[PDB]
Amino acid sequence: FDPSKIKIEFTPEQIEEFKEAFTLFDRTPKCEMKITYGQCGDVLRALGQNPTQAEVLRVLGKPKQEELNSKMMDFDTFLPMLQHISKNKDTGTYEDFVEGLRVFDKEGNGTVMGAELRHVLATLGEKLTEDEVEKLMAEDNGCINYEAFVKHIMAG
Amino acid sequence: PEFDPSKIKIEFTPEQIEEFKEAFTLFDRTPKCEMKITYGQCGDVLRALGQNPTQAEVLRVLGKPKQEELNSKMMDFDTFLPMLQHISKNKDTGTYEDFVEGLRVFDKEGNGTVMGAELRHVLATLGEKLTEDEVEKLMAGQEDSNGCINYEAFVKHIMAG
Amino acid sequence: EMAAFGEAAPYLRKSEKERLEAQTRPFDLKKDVFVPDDKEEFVKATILSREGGKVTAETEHGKTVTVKEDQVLQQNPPKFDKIEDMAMLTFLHEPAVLYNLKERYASWMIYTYSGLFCVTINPYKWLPVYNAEVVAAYRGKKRSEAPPHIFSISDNAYQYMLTDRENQSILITGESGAGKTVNTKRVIQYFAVIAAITLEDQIIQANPALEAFGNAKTVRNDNSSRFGKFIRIHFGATGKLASADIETYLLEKSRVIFQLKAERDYHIFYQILSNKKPELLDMLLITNNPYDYAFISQGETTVASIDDAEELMATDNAFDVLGFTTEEKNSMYKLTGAIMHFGNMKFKLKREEQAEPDGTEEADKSAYLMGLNSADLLKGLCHPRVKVGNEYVTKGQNVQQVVYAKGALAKAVYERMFNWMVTRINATLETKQPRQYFIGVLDIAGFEIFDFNSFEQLCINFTNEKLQQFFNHHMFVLEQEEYKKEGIEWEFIDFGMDLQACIDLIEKPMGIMSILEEECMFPKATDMTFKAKLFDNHLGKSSNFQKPRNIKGKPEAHFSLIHYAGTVDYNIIGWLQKNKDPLNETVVDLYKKSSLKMLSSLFANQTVSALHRENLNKLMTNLRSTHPHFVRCIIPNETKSPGVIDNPLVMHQLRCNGVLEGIRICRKGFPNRILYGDFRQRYRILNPAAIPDSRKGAEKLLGSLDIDHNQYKFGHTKVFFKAGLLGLLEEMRDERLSRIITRIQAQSRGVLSRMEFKKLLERRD
Amino acid sequence: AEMAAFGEAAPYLRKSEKERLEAQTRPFDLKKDVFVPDDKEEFVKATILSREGGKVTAETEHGKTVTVKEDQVLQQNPPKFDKIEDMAMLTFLHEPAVLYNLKERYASWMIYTYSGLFCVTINPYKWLPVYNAEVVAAYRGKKRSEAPPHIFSISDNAYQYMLTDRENQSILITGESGAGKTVNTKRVIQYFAVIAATLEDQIIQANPALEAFGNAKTVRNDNSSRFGKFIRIHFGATGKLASADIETYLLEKSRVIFQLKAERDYHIFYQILSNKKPELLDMLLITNNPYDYAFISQGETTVASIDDAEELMATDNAFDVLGFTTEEKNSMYKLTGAIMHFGNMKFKLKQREEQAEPDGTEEADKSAYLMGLNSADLLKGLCHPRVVTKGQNVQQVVYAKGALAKAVYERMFNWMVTRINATLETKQPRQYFIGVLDIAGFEIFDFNSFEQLCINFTNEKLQQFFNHHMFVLEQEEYKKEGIEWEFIDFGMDLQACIDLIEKPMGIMSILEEECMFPKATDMTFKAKLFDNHLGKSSNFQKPRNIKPEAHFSLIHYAGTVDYNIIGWLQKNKDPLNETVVDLYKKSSLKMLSSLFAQTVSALHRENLNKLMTNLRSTHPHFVRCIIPNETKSPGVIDNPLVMHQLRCNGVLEGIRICRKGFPNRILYGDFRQRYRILNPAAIPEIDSRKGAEKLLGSLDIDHNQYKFGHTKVFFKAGLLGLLEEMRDERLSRIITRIQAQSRGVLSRMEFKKLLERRDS
Ligand SMILES: COC(=O)N1CCN(Cc2cccc(NC(=O)Nc3ccc(C)nc3)c2F)CC1
Ligand SMILES: COC(=O)N1CCN(Cc2cccc(NC(=O)Nc3ccc(C)nc3)c2F)CC1
Ligand SMILES: Nc1ncnc2c1ncn2[C@@H]1O[C@H](COP(=O)(O)OP(=O)(O)O)[C@@H](O)[C@H]1O
Ligand SMILES: Nc1ncnc2c1ncn2[C@@H]1O[C@H](COP(=O)(O)OP(=O)(O)O)[C@@H](O)[C@H]1O
Ligand code: VO4
Ligand code: VO4
Ligand SMILES: [Mg+2]
Ligand SMILES: [Mg+2]
């Protein structure tokens, strides 16, 4: 197996802190400490990681939509996945994020129109849903100061 | 003491000498009919005998005379003949092409024609100026129906005469 | 994927199977060549023998030819088949270019990039490549992902405008029927559709309205433009469509009253007579027969490719969308009808040599529609008033004199009505919306040679000559000047592309126009005093001026002019009258005192050659303050045959256009250049670490990339890019932007997931 | 004098053979006699006393002891080069050689100097006897060797180029305000009009008529041109004077109703008020006091150098010679008087509403009477313009009143130009033209507004026209013709500054866009300029306030100008009361009715680009006018002021391209037509290039001074001067031989008569 070759570097105290956190995602009636394949990414993010949809699907072993909705996963199968995702450090700099949003700044002024940023985030890259964009965005005239916005998304 | 006409060799045939003697004689205006010319009428006799010297060239064979010498200094045929021989030696009298190129300067539109009044002005003001009398005698006749001269035809005319 | 283009996809880019076929086609670089052909310019061949400086090859048809080593040209490997940009070809020569174009055309791919300009061959068949789906498919695409198309040129011009902060022009060249009007209308379609995501509706409808009055069937084109035009599309500082305007140049007045054998008058006359709107025939007091109207029935009356009935609906609808009132539309139709009746006014000699009317019926109808008195009209035409000093007396006129005057008036009404319509379209297109830039589109009347060439062919062909020189100056003069001015190591190349000798023959003092203008100021001047002055000043003096090449049976001429696109034989009869354009002032005064408001205003207001030369020099300056983008339209054959290429005809156009020379300056030079500040704004995203000064920033940024460092040069104010470097930097920027947005989204997903986890932790099942 | 047909002008044009010899034999040592930099005089003459370790110790001409570096020391030109006519012929070409040549000629009242193919002229501030019919006669056809530098010489050369090259010419006269552009423009016209000698009389009288209405006293010039103009003088194919026309550009409308402290309104107002023609004061219903008329008395009213009485006679006479009728002249005077009364119309607010109403009717009555209007209609139109009426406060009426006065004046000026053109038009055939350009020159006042930007932008564009022709097109010509040439960067390019003013997102463009926003203010316009250009455009800076306040600085070619942006939006839009305009259309005065039968920056930019194209289709000849000092002092030179003008004009760079390049060129066919006379044997009567190679190779000349191009032979200007002397001497020899042959014919004709009497 690919998860079997991965070495657990977390302290026993860290394991238990991820274990206590994992419990809030468990929706099993008998509380058997299990989450669906489709909610792995949400737990990885809750635990401080920021993987792409592609990265989550790779640690899950390229699952089908049926596996995402109904295949179960315990803490023991999740912990090696968390360790692998924890290894990636090329998550993009503050300068990359500002340079990316600067593309959409039609003039000099370090602002972008709210509707344009909402469109870009919902159409380009790994598309966010209109629900995710509304929750994320909720603007000054109706413009976003993209340098502040990057500081905001990176602090959260 | 020596002279510049004395060093010149007479190459004309005795028959030519006698022909030039009569021509020289027809220009005689002396009161005693002595058959002598003034220094100033030498150019005329040189030209009548087929030469075309400039005023500068005539004055040089005459030994750079004063106006008083031109009007009243008498000359016999014997002093004239060596002068005629010297003038006869100059062959750099200008080509037909030089004469056309000279008159072409005044052709404003590349016509092959020049306005009569302009040619009359040029001939009476530039170079060794002709008198208004000499220009009238030379130009008549004449200009075309519009008052223009076909220079080049005019060059052929002046060179044939 | 080519999926976003829909049904257009195969007509824009070859299939994945075909590029796998090109990638695996066996080829012998030493055998597979091009050889000259006396009937096909060049042919493909395989060398048989190899060696003593002589090569023996097997033709593609195939014959056995023996040619010299120097005459043999190498074929480009199959990888280069139907290549999108011909500046990317390994061997660049005449048959490589010709065969790339022929092969794309055989596949109905009519657009090809030629470095920084475009080549287009007329398909003579409508293809499904010009719809809103294709407009949308191209929106924002700069090469690579975007196959060659008129929408691509238009889009690229729009991006240059915003990046460089300068005005743009799309200059569409070509002979008559090459495709300039078709491509002009597709540039407009692109921008109007992009704006719709109405001014957009009105910009599109301006051309059907103008074409009805300014276009006609000639021997070369069924829809020939008989006037020139420059359409400016205005944009706001951020690139939003703001306004538009149209400038028209010199309508061919003579077509209104005269037609050659295989020609028609302006479309409108036949559109009205189609009887599609029967109320127009009744309003104009006309029949449905064009042979009843003298000025309009001299040549042809029907065109197989034109449905005059359907086109009348297009014309009338165009006016509605443009906001023309019922009085405006009706007045235009009525004046067109008045012109029709005017031509049918017959005259006869009194045993005197004075004209008098034959009948009065058509004069009565003319005057009624024009709001004039027919007794006044007929007296004005037969006895024009002349001023002696104190009293007004009349001038005598014979039938030939009245007939000439009758025609001159009709042409003046028509041209002024066309001018009114342009002004009226401009009043609609004008929005009072803030502007900052513009994209100008130039659609001239193309190069033409008829059996009979007069003054109108000289004006047309002179405009074409001036436009090719504009290409020559920009591509080979200003381009090389730019490198020097900026301190780029550059050795001057003479491309042999200069038409100044011919331009000087037509427009400079003592030239054809100047001699004509001076002759117009001499009252006793004739066509033959004019013919003599041309010969006296130019035969054996001007290389482009020659004797005519007259043939018995065919119409004769007075001289030949060696134009860029060919030698044209010109007939000088009536050029003085054409240039002066005299009008009967007695009738002009009746037009000023007209009860029909439009006619009254048309005439309320030196020579044709003076005005034409002024408009051309004004145009050439508006264009010099612009970044130009050339579209080179090519006619494939002389028989309007779809998919058929006449090799000598295509090659002649490629040569006189300087297509090869144009590709060469793009390959050898640095076609793209950007200011250091603008370079930092656009390409810092590639490596922000290299730019934590603007010139050093560009040196550090570019030096840090895995690129060929011989492909860019540093100037005093700009970075210069070789051909292909921009395309790489644009692919690298797009991929990096896609990765950054994906990382912004991954971080954003982490925030939202952490927000919800905080709600769960606060105690929320 | 010696070779003078110039009369009394001779010493003011070329120095005596006596001076030539005193110069030549004066004390001079090439190793000692040098130029050194000076912190107050730019450069000074000096004699080297010491030299050690790359440091030179010299004795100044004043004289102090200076110690400078070897690289700072510049060589003086030997006495043979004293007061040289063409500065391109100087052995050592540098800034002090040029400056001191000009200073020394000026000290001798020789105000014209050749600078290669262009000319430099320094304002004498004194009238010299160099511009009369005798001097005109003496320049006719003369070559640069037989003709001292003069404006008549530039005019004549232009005329020769026109006939030989068969192309249109232009004489472009540059300079700051008061440099001498209008003076030299009028002397170009005088030259051609005298050469021709009523068209000649009318061409000369067009300028006194235009100057009365378009010229005014500014702090810089007592006769400042407040409009630009291009005069075309038309010629027939053989060079006979045919016709003339005048194109005027943008008259300064604001001067009509407003004046700064040390300024006057247009000359005409003071000419009328002079009481020289007392019937005009009675006809116009005016007093003789300018202080009674608001519009014209804000600044100064009298100028020491101007006799307004004498000038009124010059104006009235100019109109007579131009064929203006009594009704034409009277209508112009009456409208000028109407404008004077219009400025004195007072208004007040209504008791209970922010609405204006008249405060008196006397001046309105006089205005309407002269304008052929009803004063009740005029006052109702100004207070209640029709849309149903619009409301107007006093500030609104006052502004509208001024806008209408300026519109009448400008249109009347436009009418006068058209009327002069109708007279100048002879229906005589033409083939070529010589165009003369007289713009309003570079100026800096204590207060610089929109009109100074338009003026200084025109000057900036004209210097770039010089730069482009001299250093861009010139080097381009050599390359396209295949002449061996290495590109030289002369450092003369003003595109950055031109782009800041006229390109999209520039000053004019921002202003134009702001005019299309109804809520826009002068301060919203100031913000957009700063947001787009401060720290982005090098030529755009912060103002340098001290006295009247400015909003920004513009680094122009000739200096840094501080601009005030107040009222630029209204100035650019130029709104007019359409109800009053309708009364002017329905006027009983035919003139006013005919006069009235998008933005200023848009129209100005269009006129400039039209002008630059008419000029690009001509061969240009530049005349560079220089102001010597800032006090109008005759014969006094301020070294830093002269040097600054020579630098920003690019005089030295201009001389260099003439010396290093090939300023003269001729087509092979035209070369054969003109120089075959030099040696007809070299070109027998195919091939035009081979003919030129054989002819030129056959002459005793420096064969490095000509080059063979694809279509032309290129020459050094010096070589052209030699070939012209060689052609003239050879023509004199050929005419002498034609005369010798002609004398032979006449003598042979007479001899034939003598022979027929005796021998034949
Ligand atoms: C291949 O795709 C394209 O056509 N584009 C993609 C991105 N471009 C934006 C941008 C990139 C870097 C340089 C150019 N500026 C251009 O080189 N200057 C231009 C100016 C005058 C002349 C005669 N030649 C060159 C700049 F627009 C715009 C189009
Ligand atoms: C008095 O001294 C003179 O200045 N001239 C002497 C003779 N000239 C007749 C003739 C001779 C040789 C060549 C020229 N053509 C001229 O070089 N071409 C000209 C045209 C374009 C530009 C930018 N620079 C060069 C010329 F016309 C006329 C004056
Ligand atoms: N891209 C094209 N697609 C289809 N038909 C075309 C195309 N280009 C030209 N044509 C045909 O050729 C005719 C002439 O083209 P047009 O644009 O009017 O030529 P031009 O303005 O150069 O004279 C058109 O009416 C049309 O029938
Ligand atoms: N050549 C000259 N001779 C005499 N006075 C001159 C000359 N050039 C200029 N001036 C003086 O300078 C003044 C201003 O000259 P002007 O032509 O009006 O300058 P510009 O038109 O450049 O502003 C003239 O009124 C005159 O007094
Ligand atoms: O057929 V054309 O539109 O080129 O006139
Ligand atoms: O004083 V000026 O004529 O330069 O305006
Ligand atoms: Mg067309
Ligand atoms: Mg002036």
Author numbering:
A (entry chain G): 41 to 178, 181 to 182, 184 to 199
B (entry chain H): 39 to 199
C (entry chain B): 5 to 201, 215 to 367, 369 to 623, 645 to 731, 737 to 809
D (entry chain A): 4 to 200, 215 to 404, 411 to 570, 573 to 622, 645 to 732, 736 to 810
What did the study's authors say about this model?
To visualize how OM stabilizes states of myosin at the end of the recovery stroke, we co-crystallized the bovine β-cardiac myosin S1 fragment in the PPS state with OM bound (OM-S1-PPS structure) at 2.45 Å resolution (using vanadate as a Pi analog). In the OM-S1-PPS structure, OM binds in a previously unseen pocket of the motor, which we call the “PPS” allosteric site. This “PPS” pocket is not only separated by more than ~18 Å from the previously described site in the PR state12 (“PR” pocket), but also its environment is completely different. OM occupies a pocket that can form only in states of the motor with a primed lever arm. In this buried pocket, OM is at the center of a network of interactions between the N terminus, the relay helix, and the converter domain. The nature of the interactions is predominantly hydrophobic, although the methyl-pyridinyl ring forms a polar contact and the carbamoyl-amino moiety makes five polar contacts with both side chains and main chain atoms of the surrounding residues. Interestingly, comparison of the two OM-S1-PPS molecules present in the asymmetric unit reveals that both OM molecules are in the exact same position and interact similarly, consistent with the fact that the drug is tightly and specifically bound. In particular, the OM drug is more tightly bound in the “PPS” site, as indicated by the electron density map, and the fact that apo crystals can’t be grown spontaneously in conditions where OM-S1-PPS crystals grow, arguing in favor of a full occupancy of the PPS site by OM. In summary, the drug binds into a pocket via induced fit and consequently stabilizes the lever arm in a fully primed position.
In cardiac muscle, cardiac myosin comprises, in part, the thick filament of the cardiac sarcomere and powers cardiac contractility. The force produced by myosin motors is generated by coupling the sequential release of the products of ATP hydrolysis (Phosphate (Pi) and ADP) to a series of strong actin-binding states and the swing of a distal elongated domain of myosin called the lever arm. Omecamtiv mecarbil (OM) is a selective, small-molecule cardiac myosin activator that binds to the catalytic domain of myosin and increases cardiac contractility in preclinical models without affecting cardiac myocyte intracellular calcium concentrations or myocardial oxygen consumption. Here, we describe a previously unseen conformation of the bovine cardiac myosin motor in the PPS state that OM stabilizes and binds to with high affinity.
